[PDB]
Amino acid sequence: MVSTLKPLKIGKHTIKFPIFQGGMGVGISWDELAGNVAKEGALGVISAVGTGYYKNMRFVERIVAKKPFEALNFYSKKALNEIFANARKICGNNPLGANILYAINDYGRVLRDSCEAGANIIITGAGLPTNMPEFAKDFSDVALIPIISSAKALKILCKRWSDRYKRIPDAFIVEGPLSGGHQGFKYEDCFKEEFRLENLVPKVVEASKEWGNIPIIAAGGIWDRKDIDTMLSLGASGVQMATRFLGTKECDAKVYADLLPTLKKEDILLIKSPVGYPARAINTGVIKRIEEGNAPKIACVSNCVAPCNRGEEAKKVGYCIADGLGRSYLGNREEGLYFTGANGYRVDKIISVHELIKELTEG
Ligand SMILES: CN(C)c1cccc(NS(=O)(=O)c2nnc(NC(=O)c3ccc4ccccc4c3)s2)c1
Ligand SMILES: Cc1cc2nc3c(=O)[nH]c(=O)nc-3n(C[C@H](O)[C@H](O)[C@H](O)COP(=O)(O)O)c2cc1C
Ligand code: SF4
Incomplete structure (x- = not known):
């Protein structure tokens, strides 16, 4: 309960601890994880990607081959609404974010869906999101956070936003x-x-x-309070952590609680992705199936990302990311796709969100 970490202001919102749990798709950071994180005083973040898989397609209008048909069902508005509602059953009006990648053409639809679902913050990477305020003008209080890889991206994002909308981002990750x-x-x-x-x-x-000291949130490889303090001492206003929360009981993808305590460093690797950026995966499930020559059949049903071009790149790299991550959420160990930060092998015990925040904030 006593912490020397100080509350963090993001736009019009305040979080007790300068810690985000990073959004994780598919079905990894939904209502149980995000709700309990926000209950603890950190930013819980709901992943808006592949919400059609929620509760095995509870809220999709059409299913083909056990997959959500097209992007309107893969990014399911009703599922997103129920995930937020269920999260707030736990955390109340404590701030929650919605993570949505940029590399969908339907980007504005999912951003407004997240706003209408009750998100207080939108977080967007997997691209250069120069038009987030275009879709949020009906929701003046929702804070907008791009994820960037470099200072150059920060400068371009700030200039494009300032010139077009007379607004700049509320923070950068x-x-x-x-x-x-x-x-x-x-x-x-x-x-x-x-x-x-x-x-x-x-x-x-x-x-x-x-641009006036927009808060910077450091993400990637941050494991414990010592790493948090390192990043804060370098000028960051807070941290975003995911792999630690991947190893908590409240994770909405229950497979990870069995997979991570066995995970070896030599079984973590960077692979190709239909999204067009390297992905850090666990060498298991669909990856092993591909290497055996038992790759699942590819045929674009969910149309989940624009760079793939409806299966072109999925066929080239060998797997469909929507199919694989959805299968993992549904419990498929043989054909599921599994992601991790570089630090995943350091997960031994599966602990509660509450004990993890205690570890990260005590003192
Ligand atoms: C800022 N730029 C160019 C850039 C590039 C790469 C990474 C980052 N950094 S990052 O935005 O924090 C991210 N890290 N992982 C991400 N994964 C996803 O979006 C994702 C996860 C699951 C999916 C499932 C189905 C379809 C799409 C899917 C997309 S996004 C920034
Ligand atoms: C399993 C997994 C899935 C992730 N999926 C997404 C995603 O869909 N969108 C996103 O912006 N970031 C995603 N990330 C990145 C995290 O939000 C976060 O920025 C990063 O993992 C932090 O590094 P750490 O895991 O070492 O703490 C994912 C990370 C993991 C581990
Ligand atoms: S084939 Fe490509 S675009 Fe279609 S769902 Fe799979 S990864 Fe997404």
Whole structure:
């Protein structure tokens, strides 16, 4: 209960601790995880990606081959609404974010869906989101946070937003190459010291000075309070952490509670992705199936990302990311796809969100 970490202001919202749990798709950070995180005084973040899979397609209008048909069902408005409602049964009106990737054409529809579902903050990476305020003008209080890989992106985002909307972002998350999910770096750049998060945070904070010290949130490879203090001492206003929350009981993808305590470092690797950025995966499930020559059949049903072009890139890289992550949420160990931050192998015990926040904030 006693902490020397100070509350963090994001636009019109305040969180007791300068900690986000990063959004995790598919079905990894929904109502149980995000709700309990926000209950603890950190920012809980609901993933808006693949919400059609929620409760095995409870809220989809059409299913083909056990998959949500097209993007209107893959990004399901009614599912998102119920995930927020269920989260607020736990955290009340404590702030919640919605994470939505940029590399869908339907971006504005899902952003307004998140706003209408009750999100207080929108977080967007997997691209350069120069038009977030376009879709949010009906919701003046929702804070808007791009995820960036570099100071150059910060400067462009601020100029494009300022010129077009007379608004700048409420915060920036800078994500480094030790992160889970996709990486904002070329494969070869992920191993180079110049792009280590400790090197990126100073540059982004310095870039932020010119626009009035927009808060910078450091993400990627942050494990414990010592890493938090390191990032804060480098100018960051807070941290976003995901892999630690991936290893909590309240994670909405229950498979991880069985998979992570066995996870070995040599079984974590960067792979290709239909999204067009390197993804950090666990060497199991669909990956192993591909290497055996038993790859699941590919045929675009959910139309989940624009860069894929309805299966072109999925066929080239060998797997459909929607199908694989959805199968993991539904419990499929043989054909599911599984993601992790570089630190995933350090998960031994599965602990509660409450004990994890205690660990991260005590003192
Ligand atoms: C700022 N830029 C260019 C950039 C690039 C890469 C990473 C980052 N950093 S990041 O936005 O924090 C992210 N890390 N992982 C991400 N994964 C996803 O979006 C994702 C997860 C599951 C899906 C399932 C189905 C369809 C789409 C899916 C998309 S996004 C920034
Ligand atoms: C399993 C998993 C799934 C993720 N999926 C997403 C996602 O859908 N959208 C996103 O913006 N970030 C995603 N991320 C990135 C996290 O939100 C976060 O920025 C990053 O993992 C922080 O690094 P850490 O895991 O070392 O704390 C994912 C991370 C993990 C581990
Ligand atoms: S085939 Fe490509 S666009 Fe279609 S659902 Fe799979 S990854 Fe998404």
